[PDB]
Design a binder for this molecule. Structure first.
Ligand SMILES: CC(=O)N[C@@H]1[C@@H](O)[C@H](O)[C@@H](CO)O[C@H]1O
Ligand SMILES: *[C@@H]1O[C@H](CO)[C@@H](O)[C@H](O)[C@H]1NC(C)=O
Ligand SMILES: *[C@@H]1O[C@H](CO)[C@@H](O)[C@H](O)[C@H]1NC(C)=O
Lengths: 228, 107, 37, 230, 225
């Protein structure tokens, strides 16, 4: 019989560029005549609310609302409230959601490991790993771009942040892209681009090419002789 | 090192299956199309679920431990399937090929 | 002493794994696919 | 109140010869007379546990119920149930553990990636990544060894088995090991040893050192003598 | 009597990240009682400019008003009018300025060119040069980071965008960074980050290091005898 709040994650702030925070309704009867609003600190009105959900088997209703706000109004620190007044809840309840406290912000360090040499023998598919270590807080965003055009989201897989053992509560998380083995022996570049909320310009990018693991020099020495 | 080059004909509707030897010890058995320009070998069929991007969904693997023939079949032929298809084993692909043979379009 | 590995031969080793307190030193494989258990 | 249902990892069944199963309780109040029992799918009771644990500093209690079963029973896919009964909850809570059969067994492929070039420039730390791909099902055991002796889990961190893009049901996992920068330049060969069911030997390993992972020097001194000979 | 409208520059939108547009009022007779403001397409009100300038030394009554606005406003192209009030002015003067749409956006192509061998032989300084090229329109931003920390603006020099010689309507720029001989011989990737509104992520960067070339240097040393 509650109402929860879902803010747009930094991976959606960086992607949508149209920040939109929602409030979801859990375990309320599937009835009409519901109150929906988004009031900030001074309590002034916001953009209209649309996209009302449908009926559910467990007799619940989720009156959600999508609104357009500035990305920097959240930076200003607007305590946001979603007020809900339903028939089964005669006493209105207040919600709470905002941009939270200032964490110790550290910087992401993206290293980009190419596929192993012994993996490049069975000629099936190479795997390039973009390792983003030592950031804080969580909610890092990673995507790939070969040449200049963001790969389709079902070729690469990104893991979740996990605490680093030799460090304080700074995470580490890295994801990989499974390229074809006949494409990583062409030249074909693969840049990896990462966005974190503690970076100078909020985006870092790295790039590994085929001509990056080659040895700097050879030092062969033939000593052909005839003794034993 | 067997070289049984056969002249099995192919077409769009047509299906050609190659025959290969198997060690039967559940190693990595693969069929690989050698590229003349690249000078290396590119696996078209492997023990794992890998299939070449050009050959996605049009190839089938068929293993008989009973008769000691390892055979692969191609559902449709686009007439571009003319090259050195070599079979083999081991993790390696290039330097592990057992037998090679070049298939053919039309006839 | 040799340089390379015989494709029909098997080379293995004892790897000292633990999983807690006990230590089952188990035979590993330095050449997966030239030999099977 | 929370009750867990932890299936026995393969690292237990193959190594400890103790293919038991435990269910742990947490997030409850500090109380006693907790009736935590393991049963089979037929309603019959099995052997009980011992050495009840102690509460947590978070002012929450923790207890575990254990049952010892045989390996062939596990490999058959039987539905065991742990039931917890307490005064806090009028209805005992049940948790089910079984083995869903019908899943293929694939052999993991182990790739040992050394730290990147730009990582060995800050002169602060080096990360070696052991990547196991293609293995199915999940719950694989991985650890690291330094000059033939294992290390504590306080220096290496493994990741949960995640699905694979192009694979129907195959998975992949990462295990990173962080070491001092000067501890990797002088030699000090590291090995990653893994143990998943499907392996023919059930255990395999890979190894890297400074002279092997993406080297910048092919120092060769090959000598050939007695060319004619007999 | 004149009111220039200084628009928010993309070299300040990316640097300051606090988008503001300036209403530079110029050449009024020296008087008092000035209340200058801004309006949006909705006659949008704006927060008053802080530290507003007084009557000018030149006797030009120059009033500078900078108003904070949301960024979306400027990118949308929503127009803004700067109300200008002077004792001399019977009606508030209006400065209508909007970002102008209609220019093709072509992605920049940063290529970093490494220090020339000759400079290196003299052993005094090196110039590594980004060459952001192909960009369209103008107002590109270029800066340099080393070990992830941006360098001071007094170390590198960025040229203005000149039109491309042979290609059609398009621009190109330059950015030289001067480094010590020993600093470039020990590492120090010197990433060159270019920010421009036509980029897919508005940010790109390239890396050039002491080892960004020099292919396999063999050393066959046969002693056959
Ligand atoms: C290592 C290198 O860059 N070049 C070597 C050089 O040092 C050595 O004296 C010479 C003798 O064979 O071989 C070459
Ligand atoms: C290259 O080889 C020679 C002898 O073949 C040896 O003296 C020299 O030290 C080697 N170079 C390096 C960098 O090890
Ligand atoms: C290269 O090999 C030679 C031959 O033994 C050896 O003397 C030398 O120390 C090696 N170089 C390095 C850098 O290890």
């Amino acid at each position: 019989i509650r109402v929860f709040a879902i803010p747009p994650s930094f991976a959606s702030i960086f992607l949508t560029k149209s920040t939109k925070l929602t409030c979801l309704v859990t375990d309320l009867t599937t009835y009409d005549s519901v109150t929906i609003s988004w009031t900030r600190q001074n309590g002034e009105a916001v953009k209209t609310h649309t996209n009302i959900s449908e009926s559910h088997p467990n007799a619940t209703f989720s009156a959600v609302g999508e609104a357009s706000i500035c990305e920097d109004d959240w930076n200003s620190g607007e305590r946001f409230t979603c007020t809900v007044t339903h028939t089964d809840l005669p006493s209105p309840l207040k919600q709470t959601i905002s941009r939270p406290k200032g964490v110790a912000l550290h910087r992401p360090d993206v290293y980009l490991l190419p596929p192993a040499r012994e993996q490049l023998n069975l000629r099936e598919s190479a795997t390039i790993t973009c390792l983003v270590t030592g950031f804080s807080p969580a909610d890092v965003f990673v995507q790939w771009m070969q040449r200049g055009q963001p790969l389709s989201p079902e070729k690469y897989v990104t893991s979740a942040p996990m605490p680093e053992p030799q460090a304080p509560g700074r995470y580490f998380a890295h994801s990989i892209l499974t390229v074809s083995e006949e494409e990583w022996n062409t030249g074909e570049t693969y840049t990896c681009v990462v966005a974190h909320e503690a970076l100078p310009n909020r985006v870092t990018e790295r790039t590994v090419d085929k001509s990056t693991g080659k040895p700097t020099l050879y030092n062969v020495s033939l000593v052909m002789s005839d003794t034993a | 090192r067997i070289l049984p080059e056969v002249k099995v004909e192919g077409e769009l509707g047509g299906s050609v299956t190659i025959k290969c030897p198997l060690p039967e010890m559940h190693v990595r058995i693969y069929l690989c199309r050698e590229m003349a320009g690249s000078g290396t070998c590119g696996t078209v069929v492997s023990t794992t679920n890998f299939i070449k991007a050009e050959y996605k969904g049009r190839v089938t693997l068929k293993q008989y431990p009973r008769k000691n023939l390892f055979l692969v079949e191609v559902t449709q032929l686009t007439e571009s399937d003319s090259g050195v298809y070599a079979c083999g084993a081991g993790m390696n692909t290039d330097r592990g090929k057992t037998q090679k043979v070049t298939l053919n379009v039309h006839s | 002493t040799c340089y390379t590995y015989d494709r029909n031969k098997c080379y293995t080793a004892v790897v000292p794994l633990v999983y807690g307190g006990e230590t089952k030193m188990v035979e590993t494989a330095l050449t997966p696919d030239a030999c099977y258990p």
